Amino acid sequence: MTLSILVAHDLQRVIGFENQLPWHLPNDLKHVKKLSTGHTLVMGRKTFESIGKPLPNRRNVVLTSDTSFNVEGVDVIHSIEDIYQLPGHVFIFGGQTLFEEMIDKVDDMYITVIEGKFRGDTFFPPYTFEDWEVASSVEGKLDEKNTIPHTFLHLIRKKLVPR
Ligand SMILES: NC(=O)c1ccc[n+]([C@@H]2O[C@H](COP(=O)([O-])OP(=O)(O)OC[C@H]3O[C@@H](n4cnc5c(N)ncnc54)[C@H](OP(=O)(O)O)[C@@H]3O)[C@@H](O)[C@H]2O)c1
Ligand SMILES: CCc1nc(N)nc(N)c1Cc1cc(/C=C/C(=O)N2N=Cc3ccccc3[C@@H]2C=C(C)C)c(OC)c(OC)c1
């Protein structure tokens, strides 16, 4: 009933490499935990295999065509259309295929911009700020543990109006 994208992508829109995050960034995991806590994560089968187990304290939903898929702690779905039946705040969690499928459908997007260029093999779909309003933009703090500049965006889809 309220559907969002949750993603971290670098300056070229890279989001993954060899089924892993290209970068080590603890604050963004804290970001993800705070945002989706008590809510619903919807993700594809490869993304789930990457994480390797349900995230606690929230509903984990996996989309796959495998009818044998039945993990403990994970609710499974078999079509995009199934996502609209999930109640509450749903976060499209990844990966590339689900982002491509969902980017025109979601209300808003919570994007962590990783301010670097990483080698990648999976990408977030292109988008333009002409379409998306910057609800907030906040620089992450850097320290010994979080050494890559990053920016937390909250983007809301702009309404189409006659001008
Ligand atoms: N930086 C970030 O914020 C971010 C977010 C999450 C993931 N990642 C990353 O994204 C990468 C992988 O992305 P990916 O696109 O290759 O895989 P993926 O999107 O995570 O999911 C792959 C799978 O989901 C399925 N699926 C997708 N649409 C479906 C539909 N309409 N009906 C039924 N099943 C459907 C299939 O499962 P089956 O083949 O089992 O049928 C499919 O092959 C990783 O390398 C990873 O680290 C990073
Ligand atoms: C972080 C990757 C990513 N980033 C963004 N912005 N959007 C996103 N949609 C994601 C998606 C994402 C995620 C993760 C990691 C999730 C995770 O490990 N947590 N998040 C929820 C959670 C809930 C309860 C307890 C612990 C956690 C834990 C956070 C810690 C404090 C350790 C991940 O594995 C490393 C991954 O690999 C492909 C992808």
From Swiss-Prot:
GO terms for biological process: dihydrofolate metabolic process; folic acid metabolic process; one-carbon metabolic process; tetrahydrofolate biosynthetic process. The gene is folA. Keywords: NADP, One-carbon metabolism, Oxidoreductase. It comes from Staphylococcus aureus. PROSITE patterns: DHFR_1 (PS00075), DHFR_2 (PS51330). One of its GO terms (cellular component) is cytosol. One of its GO terms (molecular function) is dihydrofolate reductase activity. It catalyses: (6S)-5,6,7,8-tetrahydrofolate + NADP(+) = 7,8-dihydrofolate + NADPH + H(+). InterPro entries: DHFR, DHFR-like_dom_sf, DHFR_CS, DHFR_dom. Substrate binds at L6, V7, D28, S50, R58, F93. It comes from the Bacteria. Pfam families: DHFR_1. Gene3D superfamilies: Dihydrofolate Reductase, subunit A. Residues 2-157 form the DHFR domain. Disulfide bonds: none annotated. Key enzyme in folate metabolism. Catalyzes an essential reaction for de novo glycine and purine synthesis, and for DNA precursor synthesis. This is Dihydrofolate reductase. Pathway: Cofactor biosynthesis; tetrahydrofolate biosynthesis; 5,6,7,8-tetrahydrofolate from 7,8-dihydrofolate: step 1/1. Belongs to the dihydrofolate reductase family. PANTHER family: DIHYDROFOLATE REDUCTASE. Its EC number is 1.5.1.3.
